[PDB]
Design a protein around this ligand. Structure first.
Ligand SMILES: *[C@@H]1O[C@H](CO[C@@H]2O[C@H](CO)[C@H](O)[C@H](O)[C@H]2O)[C@@H](O[C@@H]2O[C@H](CO)[C@@H](O)[C@H](O)[C@H]2NC(C)=O)[C@H](O)[C@H]1NC(C)=O
Ligand SMILES: *[C@@H]1O[C@H](CO)[C@@H](O)[C@H](O)[C@H]1NC(C)=O
Lengths: 113, 100, 271
């Protein structure tokens, strides 16, 4: 079976199957990492998802064993490029597009070059 | 179902205290076809000398992402949206130790 | 961020014919905007509860409460989508409520609750209640969101929860470091009912210097279901050094529930 495929576009059924049903308990480590970070909720009412969580590195450097910052080590953001759907309007008329959004998922600690 | 316009608008794994190895998650129907799923190299973190400090944990960062699968599996531009779990990187945390 | 029971979840209220189940967090109202949108939920409040399954397991559940506003927009209310967002992973979960019988009075104010979203200990979630139809492009909000925070397994009613216990919240190793004659150490500890390995982590120090004179690590492999809860003992030969006497033994579990990030248990032996 195949639908009538129209030109210069795509058919996007939105029935999103979550083939990845985790079953691997994750936690709030953002506070514990050597490169700690804060989370910010992002709301774009004309996007799907409307809510995107971006992370922000707490410092320029990595926190040590005593609890103070170490500048000889750098705190770097680790990014994941994902897809979002974008709703646009000219007026009553509504268009749909796919956008690539780079999301900062958290911070890791790297030795400089 | 929505008609969408066809135009879809660094080396930390080796450098990081908590380093990782990228694994080939290949799929001919799904877009992106290949996704690199990062898996932690050690249980612990790499210390100031270059050895593993087992008094530290190397845990991975995980994310939900939007991918598109070809639906039907053969058709050209007919896709169905998919949600998946991806291990992106590893960070190094301090473990929760309970004393006596 | 899993639903509780695929049971016949009910939202049916007196004077309100209601039905609930599963949704992709993308509604027809977002793709196809309806002109007359209803007003935002009033006084949203998420509070932590626990749930007991027919199997006898106890789980933390996000208890979503809300009401609606007095205004005339009520007649144009068709349902409500409820999102739960895991901040760390961006993991979304939604349930829509389909109002079959339209609400037309306000004689009695309507109050709403959902308590099936199961939430994991020590976490952060943005719980949103979106009224449906969603507002037209460049329309006013119409939803409400609240940041909900679940506590760690140190929390009283938390450490008796299934997810906590499974990550050894109620485990006690009763860890004991008895000194042996030929400058050795027997390390005694009780084991958990999971066939995962453990790691003993020795860090000997002088009498006050807080820097390791000797550091050793030893692997205790996965016990069989027989060896579950039965006390294990490992004898290790110490560094035969003067002053290097004040020991620190740290047993680390590797339970599936945490993998590495598990709770370690520390013992400190003097001279
Ligand atoms: C990053 O976060 C800093 C600390 O606050 C966090 O708040 C969280 C609340 O959910 C959570 O408790 C976490 O553990 C905390 O670390 C913010 O720093 C604060 O900034 C204020 C001024 O804006 C000061 O008055 C505070 O003293 C200061 N906190 C500290 C620890 O000094 C940062 O502003 C924030 N930065 C970004 C980029 O989000
Ligand atoms: C492990 O032991 C605890 C306490 O006896 C119990 O809650 C748990 O269900 C046990 N699990 C197994 C698989 O024995």
């Amino acid at each position: 079976s195949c639908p009538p495929v129209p030109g210069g576009s795509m058919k996007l059924d939105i029935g999103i199957i979550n083939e990845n049903q985790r079953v691997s308990m994750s936690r709030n480590i953002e506070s514990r990492s050597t490169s700690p970070w804060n989370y910010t909720v992002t709301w774009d009412p004309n996007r799907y998802p409307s809510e995107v969580v971006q992370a922000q590195c707490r410092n320029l450097g990595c926190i040590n064993a005593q609890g103070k910052e170490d500048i000889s080590m750098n705190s770097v953001p680790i990014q994941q490029e994902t897809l979002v759907v974008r709703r646009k309007h000219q007026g009553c008329s509504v268009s749909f597009q796919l956008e690539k959004v780079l999301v900062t998922v958290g911070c890791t600690c790297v030795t400089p070059v | 179902t929505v008609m969408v316009n066809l135009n879809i608008h660094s080396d930390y794994y080796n450098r990081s205290t908590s380093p990782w190895n990228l694994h080939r998650n290949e799929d001919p129907e799904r877009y992106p076809s290949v996704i690199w799923e990062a898996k932690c190299r050690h249980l612990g973190c790499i210390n100031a000398d270059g050895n593993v400090d087992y008094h530290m944990n190397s845990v991975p960062i995980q994310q939900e992402i939007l991918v598109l699968r070809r639906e039907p599996p053969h058709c050209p531009n007919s896709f169905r949206l998919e949600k998946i779990l991806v291990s992106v990187g590893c960070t190094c945390v301090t473990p929760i130790v309970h004393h006596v | 961020l899993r639903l509780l029971d695929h049971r016949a979840l009910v939202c049916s209220q007196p004077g309100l014919n209601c039905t609930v189940k599963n949704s992709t967090c993308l509604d027809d109202s977002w793709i196809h905007p309806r002109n007359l949108t209803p007003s935002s939920p009033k006084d949203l409040q998420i509070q932590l509860h626990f749930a007991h399954t027919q199997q006898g397991d106890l789980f933390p559940v996000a208890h979503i409460e809300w009401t609606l506003q007095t205004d005339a927009s009520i007649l144009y209310l068709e349902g409500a989508e409820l999102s739960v967002l895991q901040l760390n992973t961006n993991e979304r979960l939604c349930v829509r409520f389909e109002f079959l019988s339209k609400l037309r009075h306000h004689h009695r104010r309507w109050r709403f609750t959902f308590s099936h979203f199961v939430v994991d200990p020590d976490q952060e979630y943005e719980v949103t209640v979106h009224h449906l139809p969603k507002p037209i492009p460049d329309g006013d909000p119409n939803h409400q969101s609240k940041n909900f925070l679940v506590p760690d397994c140190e929390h009283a009613r938390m450490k008796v929860t299934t997810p906590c216990m499974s990550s050894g919240s109620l485990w006690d190793p009763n860890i004991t470091v008895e000194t042996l004659e030929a400058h050795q150490l027997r390390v005694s500890f009780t084991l958990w009912n999971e066939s995962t390995h453990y790691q003993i982590l020795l860090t000997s120090f002088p009498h006050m210097e807080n820097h390791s004179c000797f550091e050793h690590m030893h692997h205790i492999p996965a016990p069989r279901p027989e060896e579950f809860h039965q006390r294990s003992n490992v004898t290790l030969t110490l560094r035969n050094l003067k002053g290097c006497c004040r020991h620190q033994v740290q047993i680390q579990p590797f339970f599936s529930s945490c993998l590495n990030d598990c709770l370690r248990h520390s013992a400190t032996v003097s001279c």
